[PDB]
Amino acid sequence: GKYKKGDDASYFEPTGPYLMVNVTGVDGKGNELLSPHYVEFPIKPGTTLTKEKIEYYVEWALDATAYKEFRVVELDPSAKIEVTYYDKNKKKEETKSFPITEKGFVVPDLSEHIKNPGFNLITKVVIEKK
Amino acid sequence: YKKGDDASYFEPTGPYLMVNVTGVDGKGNELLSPHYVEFPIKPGTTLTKEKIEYYVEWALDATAYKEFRVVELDPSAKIEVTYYDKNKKKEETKSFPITEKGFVVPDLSEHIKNPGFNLITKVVIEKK
């Protein structure tokens, strides 16, 4: 490609829990500047993900694009981290949502159901150049 | 490695600004009929009215009017980009007005590697 997202990034699917960032970067006046690029970051259950760590993960997800030099200004207040998996026991698909807060929430261990759950972050973020 | 020197004899492989300019004098007599030039651009750049003015002046340097300066730009000018949305399977077109504050060049990577940002305008030019 002309900008192949993935310097070295794993060629095969992740072997453990990961955070998937899919943000759309916008300016203040509501103009879309950057379309969502797929980016993965491994995470560990037991970790606490706060709003500040989320802000830094999205700034790092931009470094994978042409907007590598932008900083996060403001994260959509309604963003949440969602995870979807199939529960072995009940036999249904289930989805958990965690809100992005200052105190934060702890990464759950869903390994009993899936070894590599995908924690999804899909929002808009106002970004500005450094 | 950035975005290319003297520019390609083929189609660019990165975002680029296509400049289509008609140069007139202070009386609207036409001096230069539509003249086309390409400039590579980088997503994330803020394109202001003043920057556009400089780009059109540079566009004139490859013509009999290289010694002329841009005096006024048509106030109805706009930058438009047309691409094919890969999610919607349709043609999409975005317009950006030329203003003093300007606008930030979007990255349309998800849909097209080398989008062409079209600038069609008429400008008053006068010898320096």
UniProtKB/Swiss-Prot annotation, chain A:
* Record's subcellular location: Secreted
Top-level division of the source organism's lineage? Viruses
Query: Keywords, A to Z?
Result: Pharmaceutical, Plasminogen activation, Secreted, Signal
One GO cellular component from the entry? extracellular region
GO BP: symbiont-mediated activation of host plasminogen; symbiont-mediated suppression of host complement activation by activation of host proteases
Main location group: secreted
Name the job this protein performs.
Answer: Potent plasminogen activator that converts plasminogen into plasmin. It forms a 1:1 complex with plasmin, which in turn activates other plasminogen molecules.
User: Belongs to which family?
Assistant: Belongs to the staphylokinase family.
The name under which this protein is listed is Staphylokinase
- Source species of the chain: Staphylococcus phage S phi-C
Q: Which gene encodes it?
A: sak
